[PDB]
Amino acid sequence: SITLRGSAEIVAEFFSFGINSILYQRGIYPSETFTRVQKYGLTLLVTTDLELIKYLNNVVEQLKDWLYKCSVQKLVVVISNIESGEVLERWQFDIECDKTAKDDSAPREKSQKAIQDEIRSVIRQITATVTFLPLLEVSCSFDLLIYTDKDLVVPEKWEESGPQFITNSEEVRLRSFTTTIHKVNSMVAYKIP
Amino acid sequence: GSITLRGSAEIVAEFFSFGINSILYQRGIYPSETFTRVQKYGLTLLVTTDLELIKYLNNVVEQLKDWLYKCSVQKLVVVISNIESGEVLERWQFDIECDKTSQKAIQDEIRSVIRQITATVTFLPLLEVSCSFDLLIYTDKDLVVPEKWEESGPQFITNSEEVRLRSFTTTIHKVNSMVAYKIPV
């Protein structure tokens, strides 16, 4: 059994490792930037750069918050050529949320194993994605997007931003894990050569 | 759907290998740590490193590289089925575009395949039980095919835990033959 207490966390945790494993599997940050660790029963890499750690701790944390409340539905990783500004790759996580859970008599029935396994297969897929994605050879920087309700108060630093879709694109839809309180559809979108 | 492998023989085999590999990875048939990244044709590819499999996937692919140099094999079909159940779980079908026998060319081919395989694994349910592989080499009713290859086929077992796969077996199914004609007038 599992509760909003934690299902908020599980998904936040996912975004940490995912965003890391995206950044590493892409060439966003240097390969030696990251360290080899165990989670979900795979070996993923998380970053070492203090700047990037402090950064992600803030987002993983801020998401944990909003997930509890069901404010956030989209999280996007926008990979853009820092030389030009142009967008080259775009990882997009849709978050179907079950509002009627704050009000649940009993915790949902679903083993840790279950959920920690649906993910093992998502992350696993994102990894095998490496073949057909085009290679980023220009200096690229990333950026997060969070989609949320107008009916929410967001800390002062954030600010409204264009969607930044890819001029000429090709998407590929991926597996979707779910805690029964949060479903996360994941799909990548690359620039057609 | 079904994936189309176009090319000469020395190649189409290698492609099959890359695909049947990707399937084993993304479906968690073997573990994650079973595999490794290797680069060939300027691409990165996931391939397995369990010696059992390599031996087997090799002998079957070599014999396939052969039947192919003359376009005798029409389609390969992989049939992941529950091992006690019997019930099929999913089929992976490869249609062959046979050419009897630069690099930008190959490159695009591999991608379309891995990309196909990948977009597919999206819609499949999670696997959760033990299971058997059944490779089906579909060939011309006529063939140098040794008797053993048909019906029983060569196979291997792995009772060792940590691996979904339990038996992988190949078998040749001879069906008909095709001849392309024109009609100049």
Descriptive notes:
2 copies of one chain form a homodimer. Chain A has a single domain (1-193), classed as Cell Cycle, Spindle Assembly Checkpoint Protein, Chain A, CATH 3.30.900.10. Helix content of chain A is 30%, strand content 32%. The first copy, chain A, has 3 helices and 7 strands; from the N terminus they run αββαββαβββ. Chain A has helices spanning 4-24, 50-69, 112-128, and strands at 34-39, 42-47, 72-81, 87-97, 140-148, 169-178, 182-191. In chain A, the strands form 2 sheets. Chain A has a 5-stranded antiparallel beta sheet with strand order 5-3-4-7-6. A two-stranded antiparallel ribbon of chain A has the order 1-2. Chain A is globular, with a radius of gyration of 17 Å. Chain A binds chain B through residues 41-43, 117-118, 120-121, 124-125, 127-132, 172-175, and chain B through 22, 25-26, 28, 32-33, 37, 43-46, 110-112, 114-115, 118-119, 121-122, 126. Chain B: It comes from Homo sapiens. Chain B: GO terms for molecular function: identical protein binding; protein homodimerization activity. Chain B: Residues 6-179 form the HORMA domain.
